[PDB]
């Protein structure tokens, strides 16, 4: 059947970047043309693969990580960047083979008065490793004295909210992101393009 990309991209609600949602896609025919021929995507950078010849290849699995960030942070969803997001929220590996897709979601994720559901991680004791995700709400210690309840001398809650208002600057508007990673193990290839040897 047709791979359920509709359910990932046109998804009614999206996840906070700190708790980025992954969907494994398997056992279907992936019509990648439907994506790159929707010319509504503001970012569509692919690394290590052809633009259209993905439509001919087969893969053991396709993983779709998805989340929401602000526009000027999109540049961090790429190999070997630093910044709040790539360091503390969603790190891509250096040898990344796959595609990063982003589009402006101001008319869906901003609301008059402000949307404070979409969060991100502000403080972490160290950097995330590639494809790692952290959703702990452990009280961050920046000061010297231990915290055990809520807050004290430099005892910040680690998560912060984006404030998404429809009248924010373009750079401060919400963008929805989908990262396709391709997996070709020595096992049956279940995700195939229509122009393959298999059909």
């Amino acid at each position, epitope marked *: 059947n047709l791979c359920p990309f509709g359910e990932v991209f046109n998804a009614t609600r999206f996840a906070s970047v700190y708790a980025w*949602n*992954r*969907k*494994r896609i398997s056992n279907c025919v992936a019509d990648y043309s439907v994506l790159y021929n929707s010319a509504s995507f503001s970012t569509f950078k692919c690394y290590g693969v052809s633009p259209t010849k993905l439509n001919d290849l087969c893969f053991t*699995n396709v*993983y779709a990580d998805s989340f929401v960030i602000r526009g000027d942070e999109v540049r961090q969803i790429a190999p070997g960047q630093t910044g709040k997001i790539a360091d503390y929220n969603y790190k891509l*590996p*250096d*040898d990344f083979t796959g595609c990063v897709i982003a589009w402006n979601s101001n008319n869906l994720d901003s609301k008059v008065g402000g949307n404070y559901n979409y969060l991100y991680r502000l403080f972490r004791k160290s950097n995330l*490793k*590639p*494809f*790692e*995700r952290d959703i702990s709400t452990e009280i961050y210690q920046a000061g010297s004295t231990p915290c055990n309840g809520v807050e004290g001398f430099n005892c910040y809650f680690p998560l912060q909210s984006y404030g998404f208002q429809p009248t924010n600057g373009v750079g401060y508007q919400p963008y929805r992101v989908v990262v396709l990673s391709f997996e070709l*193990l*020595h*096992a049956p290839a279940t995700v195939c393009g229509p122009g393959s040897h298999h059909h």
Partner: antibody
Amino acid sequence: EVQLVESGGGVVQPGRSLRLSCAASGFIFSSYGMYWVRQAPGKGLEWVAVIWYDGSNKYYADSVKGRFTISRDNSKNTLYLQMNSLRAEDTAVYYCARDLSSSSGWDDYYYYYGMDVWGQGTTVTVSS
Amino acid sequence: YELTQPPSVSVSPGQTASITCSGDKLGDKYACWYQQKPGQSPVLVIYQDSKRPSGIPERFSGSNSGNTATLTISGTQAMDEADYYCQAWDSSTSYVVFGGGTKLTVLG
């Protein structure tokens, strides 16, 4: 008490085949990646296979690729290793082990950290 | 991909002992350390480079930087004499890799 118990080892002839079991108890088995790791006599630990909390994804070491099959029955709290075409260099103690990370169930995401629970092992001698 | 350890390391009781583990871009993956006494199963003593599991003595610490992970036992004791293995799970292909092990001997 968290507990892994291996069983089904023994003496077996090369080229034949054998099915090992690992019985889990005292934790929500269905929510953890599981490992098979072996140790030949006087050698080090050799990774054999690994399986996702739900059995969706399976990875094998090259030495056993195509010959072994890892599987799990989540309803019965059990991990299985089907060993086929046994060679002599397969003689070893076989441990099952649990990864310390658990999936909540909601979005096909899993990161493997250390293997914090180990069984006591089951011994497989493959001789003619 | 291979993780390569010192074959043996001896140490007097009370001294600090260090076991190294080298691999290609090992800093970019998490390292685990397991202890195995004779005729016993392995036990996890370090995970996530430096974290120590519940119930593991505090004298066990761990680091990982560059291409080298290091298990450190300060105040080494008789009951620490064992084989120690490092391990890395590649973020890619979900492949597991052990080290050759290290026979830590405490001269008691």
